[PDB]
Symmetry: D2
Subunit: 255 residues, 4 copies
């Protein structure tokens, strides 16, 4: 799994705790050229500071709000002109309003539901469509999901239905872009203390339950997600597509 | 037997709708039925279909599930007209034709979100509003297709919206369970319907089921309706967050 | 309504047996019933339980599913006594107590194969023999537990034997489907039975269904029986290779 | 990856076409010390020959018929006396009578059913129990499975039910050995022309269905199972246990 002369776009670093910073640390350490995309200017600033700890000899940062067709279209188009063709995309992007991450699911608003869908699932489809233009030779696209896409986990509410959508999106992209030699997979990460986690009702309780009940008796970290991301983005996984790998201490396997 | 029971059936379009299959079965079993339809020029059509049921009176309500107000005002009116209900059969989906063929990666945002809105989110709001009519509990059933568990060529955007619907069923089942409201899906094999003409490669799937499914035949709307009767009745007490395949066994094989 | 239907119910030991839950339901629905047992004591309990049912005749056959001879001869006798049947409810499993606690990695070969034989293989041979009494088609149902889909502390060797049973259902569905025989499983939530008294941590899992499952209560034998009636009747035509969870929704959550 | 100073035990090489031999080329290339176990004298002979193709400075071969408790016990015990502690085990062992891999599954005999369970599933339980003693600090155990374990595939008949069993066996083993830091996982390989495949009814008609229908539109090979084995056997996959990775061109994902 050595990746020199590989280029990967990582979407969704906000700070040093971001899962996508785990991927980045692991890919960068394996010698890959990286390009980063962000939404808030605070994320770019965090990216500028975190690039000091990476080996990247230059900073490729692109502002892409995935709610914008044109910002995605022109973002990847630009990445293509700056660095040429890419080997894959790590997609670490999701959003839901805080109302919608606690209390009663049946009370979700249309606007809150569609917002979570647009950012957390559909952004993958359009990223894939635009990213494919930079992978004339094939490549690898990995999204980040959560077990709550597969089962009804208390509080995760609108995001779980967005992750269900995301997971199917992976399969349909896998089928569609398969003949083009682009593999499309997901990582189902265990719960990890991140900026966005602070918004999920009951997140602390779940951390403690993994540690008590999951087979490895411990929580996972971002580097662990990065290690599997390296596998999925590299040749090591050449016959794997439409797959969902649980990086979660075995929790998905137990009841 | 379903005498003294009342269900709302959403999604009848013509003689061939899956929902009319459910209608015939529940009607036969003695339930009171209320029907919702999307557009006002399909009211007269619904009115003709009802001539074949033993419904003393025709309870029809226009609801486009794309509007909160229509869902909210619709279900309120149902409550004023008929009282508490025992359950809802949801049989509603939509996607634009150009997204049910060709390359899934080329789906527009508008088309992806439209499908989610109508085929998935509609269950949430319907469940919220229908709950108000079920103080002592009841049963809600949605219609899915196997393409929300696996990628099926051409089903495309609808497949992602069914994955979403099927999650929706589980989250509603978790939320609504303490209120004694069960939420399930039926996963129907392919059936010749008005909407099915819109899906690329449909006939080819009809043929495959016959060759490859364990029962070596296709299912019909009335078979979906018999499983609906079970899900909608006390017979399926204890069963919630479930997806039952009514598909000649196709889901189990590969 | 199951008048003029005949079902074989395998594996009642006492009034707490899941299959007696099945028995009462099909009995209420009008079916003729035939019971098979292994232990002398079970026959005795059956003779006495039959006073609670409307069966005017005791159809009691000793069939230890560890013996081919007994299964074959039993089903043949059953054919001679009552004729063709419409389905079989299989409610049989066994493992040693030592294999239902402490560490799965320590399971003996003998213990492992014992559980497979009795708890999984038994359905294949039953299906084969039962087939002969179903020239027209029928329905076969086996009873599984969620521990065959996920690792559940303590269920151990039985979880592997249930994973095997659930597969068995799928392959039997595939094989027998063109003969119009459906094969399905019911996955029951935990229920205080004689056998359950041997599973380590059974009480603890009982309580946490109450706490965590969508319906926040446990299920009972009669609720399994009502789904059995669904699966064993024409209501579930179209449905095969299926696994229906009668478990208050516990399967859908995490 | 990189696997110097790791030792892996590979069970079930018969000839050059064996899936486990793909595993073996990949771990060998990656620096690993390899120990091999076999049943038939022929398999040992093939192994001595195929060993010239590898970097292994030393042949470590052990006859273990997994139908024999004392052979598994004594084999692992002796492996540990010879090479010390190991980092994991690759299990590539299954068996059924031909009788039982065509025509009607309802006709399967008891003795053939139990035979397929014994070799194809139980063997893992005991292998893991014995392998554990050589992994005081933890390690990785991978077994090999097939989609016919998740779905009724025509003809795979009794082997499907033993794969269902093998796959639950992996989950129960993960929950149990997790606190010992031992991970347990499955590879679900697509159809690969091997000695044993020659005995499965209709195997060629599936090979061609994968090509026409699987997302990647091609079949996979023993080396692709190998490269996922290396991921699963290494620290790359820390946090993954109780998992089933489909290495099958995405066929598991479509209908
Ligand atoms: N931590 C966990 O337990 C957990 C578990 C499983 C999966 N995940 C998934 O992992 C991924 C990363 O989340 P995280 O936990 O690492 O949290 P995070 O560090 O807070 O990252 C979330 C990211 O989403 C980006 N984002 C949100 N909306 C966007 C938009 N419209 N356009 C572009 N970027 C947008 C944010 O960028 P800006 O800040 O610049 O807006 C941020 O970088 C998500 O898909 C999440 O669902 C998290
Ligand atoms: N037919 C199959 O092979 C198959 C298989 C599995 C699952 N399903 C599912 O079964 C359900 C019923 O489909 P069907 O095949 O019976 O098709 P159908 O007869 O054409 O019915 C679909 C219904 O959805 C309604 N609908 C569409 N948009 C709506 C909206 N915005 N508000 C309210 N109603 C709306 C349609 O109304 P209008 O006529 O007014 O447009 C129609 O009544 C769907 O959920 C479908 O996904 C179908
Ligand atoms: N109780 C639960 O929470 C639970 C949950 C999910 C699934 N299940 C399943 O439900 C089914 C019924 O079990 P249960 O809990 O109702 O327990 P039960 O009342 O103890 O029934 C078990 C039955 O298996 C029979 N049996 C065992 N080995 C046999 C053999 N070799 N030949 C013929 N019969 C044999 C027993 O007969 P004898 O007494 O005559 O030996 C007994 O009638 C089993 O599949 C069990 O795994 C139970
Ligand atoms: N090839 C495929 O398309 C395919 C696809 C998915 C999964 N698989 C799985 O892949 C694994 C490897 O099979 P393969 O295709 O590589 O075929 P293979 O080359 O024939 O290997 C099968 C191995 O099983 C060993 N074996 C059988 N019974 C044994 C016993 N009782 N004790 C010790 N070893 C025993 C054989 O050893 P001896 O020759 O010495 O008896 C042989 O090395 C199996 O688990 C199979 O189910 C194969
Ligand atoms: C009850 C659930 C407890 C564990 C949650 C794990 C988790 C934590 C963070 C996640 O990311 C987001 C969640 C909501 C909105 C935005 C993001 C990125 C996320 O997707 C999942
Ligand atoms: C790939 C071809 C096989 C799939 C046909 C099954 C099917 C048929 C009709 C369905 O209903 C709709 C489909 C598209 C748009 C709207 C509806 C209601 C539907 O959801 C599913
Ligand atoms: C970890 C505890 C989880 C509770 C499991 C519920 C249960 C109870 C009884 C069951 O039946 C048997 C179990 C072992 C042996 C024999 C039978 C019939 C059974 O199969 C399942
Ligand atoms: C209809 C089936 C289509 C192809 C199945 C692929 C396959 C091929 C060989 C396999 O290995 C065995 C099969 C039977 C007995 C023993 C082994 C090792 C095996 O386990 C799986
Ligand atoms: N967000 C709080 C709980 C919020 C609530 O009670 O809804 C937590 O992390 O526990
Ligand atoms: N299935 C066999 C031919 C006949 C049979 O096995 O029933 C094969 O293709 O090898």
């Amino acid at each position: 799994v050595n990746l020199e002369n590989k280029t990967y776009v990582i979407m969704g670093i906000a700070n040093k705790r971001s899962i996508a910073f785990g991927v980045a640390k692991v890919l960068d350490q394996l010698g890959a050229k990286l390009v980063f995309t962000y939404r808030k200017e605070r994320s770019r600033k965090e990216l500028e500071k975190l690039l000091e700890q990476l080996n990247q000899p230059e900073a490729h940062l692109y502002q892409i709000d995935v709610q914008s067709d044109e910002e995605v279209i022109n973002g990847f188009e630009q990445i293509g002109k700056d660095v040429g063709n890419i080997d894959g995309v790590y997609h670490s992007i999701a959003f839901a309003n805080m109302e919608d991450l606690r209390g009663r699911f049946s009370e979700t608003s249309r606007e809150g539901f569609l917002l979570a869908q647009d950012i957390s699932s559909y952004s993958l489809t359009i990223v894939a469509h635009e990213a494919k233009k930079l992978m004339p030779e094939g490549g690898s696209i990995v999204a980040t999901t959560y077990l709550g896409g597969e089962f009804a986990v208390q509080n995760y509410n609108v995001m779980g239905v967005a992750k269900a959508s995301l997971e199917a999106n992976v399969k349909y992209l896998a089928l569609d872009l398969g003949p083009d030699n682009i593999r499309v997979n997901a990582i189902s990460a265990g719960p990890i203390r991140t900026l966005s986690a602070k918004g999920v009702g009951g997140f602390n309780t779940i951390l403690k339950e993994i540690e008590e009940r999951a087979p490895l008796k411990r929580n996972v970290d971002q580097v662990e997600v990065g290690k599997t991301a390296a596998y999925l983005l590299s040749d090591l996984s050449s016959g794997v597509t439409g797959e969902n790998i649980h990086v979660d201490s075995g929790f998905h396997a137990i009841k």
